[PDB]
Amino acid sequence: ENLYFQGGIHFNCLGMGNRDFIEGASGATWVDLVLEGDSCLTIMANDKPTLDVRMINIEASQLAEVRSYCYHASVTDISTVARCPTTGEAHNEKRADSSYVCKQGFTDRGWGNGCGFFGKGSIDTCAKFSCTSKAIGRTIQPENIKYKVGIFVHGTTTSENHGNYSAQVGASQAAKFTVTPNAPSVALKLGDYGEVTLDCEPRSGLNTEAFYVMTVGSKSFLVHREWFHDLALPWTSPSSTAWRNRELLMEFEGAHATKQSVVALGSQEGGLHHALAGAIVVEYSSSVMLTSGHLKCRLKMDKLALKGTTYGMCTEKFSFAKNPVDTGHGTVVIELSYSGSDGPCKIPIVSVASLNDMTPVGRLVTVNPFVATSSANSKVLVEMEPPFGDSYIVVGRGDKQINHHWHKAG
C-alpha cells in the first residue's frame, strides 16, 4: 500500500493525552497488556528496545439486518366509503391492496345527509402508506470482528517524523496488524529488532449478544436490544418484508358524514436521536463499522533484540535542536542535532546530578539512541526520565560535551 499518500494514524504515544507506562520483568519472555482504545502503552524492559503499542480501532463487517423501523411515512390517496344506518358495514375496496391502511368508523346520518333512517352510518377509510425513511438494526457476529493494533519501536526518530506512520514504517520501526477471534495471535518482524508476538484473547472483550447496531439517518449507535424490540414504529424484518403496525405513523382524523382525512405524522428521527442521546456512537458509513474498546493480550519478546548495540559511539559535537520540555507524562523530551558524519553511531547521553558528579541518574525511554545517517546536522529525538530536582542532560564525551540544566518538581 502507498502509506505516503494515505491518512496518518495514531500508532505511538508521544503527545497523546492518555499514556500508560509498563515495566516488563527483567528477563521475562512475556508482558501482559490491556489495550484500551483511547490510550497508548509504552513498554520498557531491561535489555530490550522500548515499544509503544496501541489499539487503532475495532472493525466489524458483514453485519446482518434484524429489523427495520420506518421513522418517516408518507400517506396518500385517501378515500372513504360510507353507508346508511341499518345497511351494515362499509367495505372500502382498497382493503384488497396491501399498500393501503384502512379503518372502519361511524358518522351521524339522517335525512339531511342522504339516509332514509337516522343514526350511525358505517364508514371505511383507506390511505396508501409508504415508508420515506427507515432506521435499521443489525447484529455483529464475533468472527467478523477485527482489532487493528499499532506497534512502534523506539528507534531513531526526529521531532518531525516521530508520529508519522509512513515515515516510521519506512524506517522499519512501526507496524500495524490485525487480530481476530479466529486468528488471535500474530507475529511480526520489526526490522533490525527481531520480532514480537501479540497473543490476544479477543473473545473476552466481546459482548455481541448484548446489543444491536442501529443506524438512524446519518448516525449509527450501539443500542440495548430490548429497547430496540419495543420501539413504537412500523417495522419489517428479513423474514417479514411488508410493513406492520403502519398505523403508528398515521392519524385518522374526525370523520364527518361521508368524509375523513388521514395525515402522516412528521418524521420521528429527531425523537429517536433524543432517545439515543447517551448511546455509544460508532462510524458506519461504508459496509464496515468502526468502534473502540479493550483488547487483552500477552506481548512476547524473547525474539525482540537490541539493534546496533555494536555501532561505535559518535565522536563529534552535538547541539540541542529543541531544548528539553516536559511531555506531560513525567518524562522530558529533547531533540539533538549532530554535527558529525560518522553516522550511524551511538549517542552518548546521560542525566547526572551535577557536573561535579558524573554518576548516571534517571534513565532513557529512547534507550540506545543513535544517529542513523552519515548526513551532517541530522536530528535525533530522545525521550528520558530525569530524577526529581536538579540534574543536567549531558550529551557527547570529553570537550565535545554539552549539557542542559533541568529541574523536575517534587
Residue numbers in the entry: -9 to 400
What does the paper say about this structure?
Studies have demonstrated that E protein is the most important protein determing the virulence of JEV. To address this open question we determined the X-ray structures of the E protein ectodomains of JEV SA14-14-2 and of its parent virulent SA14 virus in a monomeric state and reliably modeled dimers (assembled to 180-mers) and trimers mostly present during the viral life cycle. The structures of JEV SA14 and SA14-14-2 E protein are highly similar to those of other flaviviruses. Architecturally, all of them consist of three domains, Domain I (DI, yellow), Domain II (DII, red) and Domain III (DIII, dark blue).
